[PDB]
Design a protein around this nucleic acid. Structure first.
Lengths: 88, 87, 129
RNA sequence: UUCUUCUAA
RNA sequence: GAGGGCGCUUACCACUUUGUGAUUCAUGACUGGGGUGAAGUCGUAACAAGGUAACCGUAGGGGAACCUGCGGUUGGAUCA
RNA sequence: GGCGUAAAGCGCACGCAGGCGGUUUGUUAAGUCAGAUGUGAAAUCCCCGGGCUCAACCUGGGAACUGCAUCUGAUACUGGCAAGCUUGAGUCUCGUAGAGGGGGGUAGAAUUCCAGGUGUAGCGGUGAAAUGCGUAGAGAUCUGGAGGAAUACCGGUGGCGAAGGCGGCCCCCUGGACGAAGACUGACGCUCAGGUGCGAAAGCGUGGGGAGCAAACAGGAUUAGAUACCCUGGUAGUCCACGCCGUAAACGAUGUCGACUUGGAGGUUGUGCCCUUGAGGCGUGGCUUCCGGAGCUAACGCGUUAAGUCGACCGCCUGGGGA
RNA sequence: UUAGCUAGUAGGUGGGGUAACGGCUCACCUAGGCGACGAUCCCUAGCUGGUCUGAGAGGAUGACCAGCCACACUGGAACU
RNA sequence: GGGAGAAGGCACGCUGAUAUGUAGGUGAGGUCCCUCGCGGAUGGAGCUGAAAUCAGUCGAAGAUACCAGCUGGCUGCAACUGUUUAUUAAAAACACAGCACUGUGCAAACACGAAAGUGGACGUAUACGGUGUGACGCCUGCCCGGUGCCGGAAGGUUAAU
């Protein structure tokens, strides 16, 4: 899973305050790095029965955590998915 | 029963049919006698019900009960039916 | 989850009568006070006490008569899934006028018999009897 | 251990 | 002189024809079940622990109800 | 109008369109309301009249024609527009419990099989038997070995997962939940047709593996018959790898997310305080079991985890057979 | 148990045409147009004031009277 | 994937215009760079040249000759491409990918060889030999009495000795 220091850097990456942690920009990037850490676990395991359901939970759990940052702010949504490399 | 479901789908009032379709919404229809005979009824009653197989105006071949007691009916005879089932 | 504070309010009034409570409290709204300032005036509650700074909380006092309750009925007409807007002529008569119907028109919140004398219709909130 | 059936008022 | 007439041809198009589909009705040797019997034949599965508790799925078997295997349900009885 | 059992809640989960929306301030005036114009033909109907001797009928006037258009307002609500707030919702921080998941090992009993020692006449099975297995030495007994499958006790009206479900131990990867103090975010929410995934067992497809068990099948009984129940066998199958199928009484026969509403006895899992004065008391959470008040219910029952009181949205029902 | 439909189609420019505007027609561009708020296709049908029932809500209904529409042996076409 | 060139139907010459050669192809002389070359850009003369439209125009007929598929419907059998009775029989016969059984541990099984030896195979059980069946789909029931095969070694029988 995503370690504490790695989460702390991503907070310090997009820190409006360096203490803010209600930045969805951070939070999108957290599950981004979390499941990119897990893409080596689910390209490996595809019979991960309930871990694969966790992948699905994190299939949707990353997905809808994007979905307000989808509708979050056009001046910043344009900037963020540029930096995060999001396809859409 | 939610009104959104009621919006997306109206209440389908059930459509009823006639039990006497051969008259085709007429009071009486002319017919031609095809076979005149008797028939035993179902279990609670025991009789010989006088009855005639009828060719109609519209080509329908139906059976129709002879009311009363005694008649002078032949085959190839012109009759007239009013309706009503026999139970 | 939270689809209405008004239907929350009337049911908390409704369940408090049968529970024989003397004080029903809830977080307050601007529209909640505008209704609660009618039923004291119309004589269906005894006291409301709006308090709270970060978040206003309306605390009511239930009116009981001869041991039993006063609010014999409390309903909701314009639900959030289906709104009700009736003119001044189609204002109802709750229990043949013996009960009251809370209507909000452009002139704030009042009862129907006042709104008939105001001569202008609007949105019927609820039935209180 | 084994052991079925009772027409139509 | 132009124009008009008539005919000429062109354009459009009715009638009509060709093929191929589609759809619907009627009909069809034969065949599939269905429902119905005031008396037949065969067995007696279910209703009680219905005399191998019952039933869902699914599979197999078998004149016929059915039987059996796996899993589930209780909408099953029993209790020094 | 209804969906616990009388027909009826998809097997669950996800989620778009969709419908629905906390709080507070302005703005807008769209919806909404009010007023006013236009039109809404006549007839008809209604009301008040009149006329035919009345009545039917004829006919005068009125109302009505429930609308639509336009104009003038109105500003509470619902929208539209902006700004806020933090309770909803979501992060960050430490921990907590767990058959939560995959992957790879590893144990120990059992059973089977193989080989051997010992030993002898039965063994096995049933209600009785018999088929069967036995002197070609079984059974039994000990010793050695092999293989597959499941993981006693713990263990629990326990635990976890949305369910389907998950049970030796260890390792690797991985999920979810809860609690605690906080910090932050600013409504970021709910439900969701169509869609997407998961989804018992049996079955299907290739491969593998195959101890036990076991449809079919075979024998033996059994009986009037016995394609059954019982016995002795025994194959697919059960196991694994990867795919298909997508059904189960997939049941709590109760769809999901809110809010309110008497209790008692528990279980499990946190977390404060009080001296823990012992396995104690006072708290405060999460989850779950039984009972049961009001209430509801055709009754049965449910009964703060509602089948009570209300909210939002979806699915479904409409005599029985046919089906 | 009707889901895709459309090529003058959809738009433009230009020319032509009609009392009139406009693929009305033609030429040339453009690839658009439509549809799950039901296009498309099939079945049935003249429409409304009204009529009948219903407490109402509604339901059914369009003979007679009206308002409109369509048709005139059938299929066609112009003429005036 | 196909069936399917399904079937069925329309156009076809010549002349002119478009455009006295068009689309296109080729490409000089020029011009500049140039490490200056068996250069690079630019540049377009020149030649070459489709296809289409429009309008004419000839015949009875314009893919005019030569050249160059008859199509459709049902059913048998074999899945198919293949192979064969040289010289009366080309198929339903054979072969076939596929399936199943069986044998075989390498100095393999097996075959040719008096033998030596060789093939097998410079392959090693996902290998090889043999037999049967003959894609694919759905499948594949019962009987070991008989005949074979395999397994057994108690007893009977029994060779040379």
């Amino acid at each position: 899973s995503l370690s504490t220091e790695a989460t702390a850097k991503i907070v310090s990456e997009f820190g409006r305050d360096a203490n803010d942690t209600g930045s969805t920009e951070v939070q999108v990037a957290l599950l981004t790095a979390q499941i990119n850490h897990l893409q080596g676990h689910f390209a490996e395991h595809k019979k991960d029965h309930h871990s694969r359901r966790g992948l699905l939970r994190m299939v949707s759990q990353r997905r809808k955590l994007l979905d307000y940052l989808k509708r979050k702010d056009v001046a910043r949504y344009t900037q963020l998915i540029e930096r995060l490399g999001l396809r859409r | 029963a939610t009104v959104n479901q009621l919006v997306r789908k109206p209440r389908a009032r059930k459509v009823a049919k006639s039990n006497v379709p051969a008259l085709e919404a007429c009071p009486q229809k002319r017919g031609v006698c095809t076979r005149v005979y008797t028939t035993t009824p179902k279990k609670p009653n025991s009789a010989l019900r006088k009855v005639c197989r009828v060719r109609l105006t519209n080509g329908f071949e139906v059976t129709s009960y002879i009311g009363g007691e005694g008649h002078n009916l032949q085959e190839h005879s012109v009759i007239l039916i009013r309706g009503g089932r026999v139970k | 989850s939270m689809q209405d504070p008004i239907a929350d309010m009337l049911t908390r009034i409704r369940n408090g009568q049968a529970a024989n409570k003397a004080a029903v409290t809830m977080p307050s709204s601007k529209l909640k006070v505008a209704i609660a300032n009618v039923l004291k005036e119309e004589g269906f509650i005894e006291d409301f006490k709006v308090e709270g700074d970060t978040k206003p909380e309306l605390e009511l006092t239930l009116k009981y008569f001869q041991g039993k309750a006063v609010v014999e009925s409390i309903q909701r007409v314009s639900r959030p899934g289906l709104r009700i807007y009736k003119r001044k002529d189609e204002l109802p008569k709750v229990m043949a006028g013996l009960g009251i119907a809370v209507v909000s028109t452009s002139k704030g919140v009042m009862t129907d018999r006042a709104a008939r004398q105001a001569g202008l219709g609007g949105e019927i909130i609820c039935y209180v009897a």
